[PDB]
């Protein structure tokens, strides 16, 4: 029963990455927690990929904890795909120390995706539905072990861009103002609950009905139904870029429309200014086209979001 904390860094508001460590005695790796996937891995010594090179590796010959399971692992993260073989070891996450974990080991990682990506590796916190054959959670472990003291996870996202935090078995009221909404969790693999309307100004210009949306860590955007999502950037207006963007004037800022998303009956606006971001004085569009909904960092930079794998909700407060 324990609470860890693990700060989480960002590189710039589209990877939020955290250190953990892997082996006796322990190496270091940063990772992007993802409630998007369940599998947890890292790159080893067996990669020769320049994105290897590029980053830590798991050096098994330098740890008396290690265990070759054989096992493979394959996964897809942006158009990047890996190559790796699952293992035994212990991993310390905070004062959080589990032992026997299944991780996978890079042997492959070709292109540019993970060589320029800020992590090391990805550790997964989705449900073990979605896990590898053979591959079993982290937050599982640390559950049927009960090293948490809940069984929930917290995730505050700093917009300013400094205090983000992930918390493992704790809910920190500091990190939010106002009352947490516990919403149902509708399917269990990714984080998924109904949305029941997308509005701007009592209009509703997406989700029609009501919809399927995913929290995902792992996304940095906004993401939905290219029909949907396309009225929402003529709402904002958004232009697209000759680069393929969606491009916002800085400026325009101002009159702008807010979109608010209504789950399990409360509302929850997103300003131009959550939605928006800026990089050297070009403002890009937080919204992105792919029938399910993604809330990536974008919603959650504006929401503190609670996982309960305990009774299965999502709680959101406004976060501070």
């Given at each position: 029963?324990?609470?860890?904390?693990?700060?989480?860094?960002?590189?710039?508001?589209?990877?939020?990455?955290?250190?953990?460590?892997?082996?006796?005695?322990?190496?270091?790796?940063?990772?992007?927690?993802?409630?998007?996937?369940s599998?947890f891995?890292?790159?080893?010594?067996?990669?020769?990929?320049?994105?290897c090179?590029?980053?830590?590796?798991?050096?098994?010959?330098?740890?008396?904890?290690?265990?070759?399971l054989?096992?493979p692992?394959?996964?897809?993260?942006?158009?990047?795909?890996?190559?790796g073989?699952?293992?035994?070891?212990?991993?310390?996450?905070?004062?959080?120390?589990?032992?026997?974990?299944?991780?996978?080991?890079?042997?492959?990682?070709?292109?540019?995706?993970?060589?320029?990506?800020?992590?090391?590796?990805?550790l997964?916190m989705?449900?073990?539905?979605?896990?590898?054959?053979?591959?079993?959670?982290?937050?599982?472990?640390?559950?049927?072990?009960?090293?948490?003291?809940?069984?929930?996870?917290?995730?505050?996202?700093?917009?300013?861009?400094?205090?983000?935090?992930?918390?493992?078995?704790?809910?920190?009221?500091s990190?939010?103002?106002?009352?947490?909404?516990?919403?149902?969790?509708?399917?269990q693999?990714?984080?998924?609950?109904?949305?029941?309307?997308?509005?701007?100004?009592?209009?509703?210009?997406?989700?029609?009905?009501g919809?399927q949306?995913?929290?995902?860590?792992?996304?940095?955007?906004?993401?939905?139904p290219?029909?949907?999502?396309?009225?929402?950037?003529?709402?904002?207006?958004?232009?697209?870029?000759?680069?393929?963007?969606?491009?916002?004037?800085?400026?325009?800022?101002?009159?702008?429309?807010?979109?608010?998303?209504?789950?399990?009956?409360?509302?929850?606006?997103?300003?131009?200014?959550?939605?928006?971001?800026?990089?050297?004085?070009?403002?890009?569009?937080?919204?992105?086209?792919?029938?399910?909904?993604?809330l990536?960092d974008?919603?959650?930079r504006?929401?503190?979001?609670?996982?309960?794998?305990?009774?299965?909700?999502?709680?959101?407060?406004?976060?501070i």
């Amino acid at each position: 029963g324990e609470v860890a904390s693990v700060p989480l860094t960002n590189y710039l508001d589209s990877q939020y990455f955290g250190k953990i460590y892997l082996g006796t005695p322990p190496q270091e790796f940063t990772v992007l927690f993802d409630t998007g996937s369940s599998d947890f891995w890292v790159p080893s010594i067996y990669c020769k990929s320049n994105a290897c090179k590029n980053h830590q590796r798991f050096d098994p010959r330098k740890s008396s904890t290690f265990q070759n399971l054989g096992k493979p692992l394959s996964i897809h993260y942006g158009t990047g795909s890996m190559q790796g073989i699952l293992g035994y070891d212990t991993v310390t996450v905070s004062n959080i120390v589990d032992i026997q974990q299944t991780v996978g080991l890079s042997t492959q990682e070709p292109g540019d995706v993970f060589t320029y990506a800020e992590f090391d590796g990805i550790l997964g916190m989705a449900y073990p539905s979605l896990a590898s054959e053979y591959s079993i959670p982290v937050f599982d472990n640390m559950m049927n072990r009960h090293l948490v003291a809940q069984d929930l996870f917290s995730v505050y996202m700093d917009r300013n861009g400094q205090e983000s935090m992930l918390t493992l078995g704790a809910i920190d009221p500091s990190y939010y103002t106002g009352s947490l909404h516990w919403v149902p969790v509708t399917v269990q693999q990714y984080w998924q609950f109904t949305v029941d309307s997308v509005t701007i100004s009592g209009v509703v210009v997406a989700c029609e009905g009501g919809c399927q949306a995913i929290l995902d860590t792992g996304t940095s955007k906004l993401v939905g139904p290219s029909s949907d999502i396309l009225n929402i950037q003529q709402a904002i207006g958004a232009t697209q870029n000759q680069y393929g963007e969606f491009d916002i004037d800085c400026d325009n800022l101002s009159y702008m429309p807010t979109v608010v998303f209504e789950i399990n009956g409360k509302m929850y606006p997103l300003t131009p200014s959550a939605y928006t971001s800026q990089d050297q004085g070009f403002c890009t569009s937080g919204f992105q086209s792919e029938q399910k909904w993604i809330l990536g960092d974008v919603f959650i930079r504006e929401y503190y979001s609670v996982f309960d794998r305990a009774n299965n909700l999502v709680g959101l407060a406004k976060a501070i």
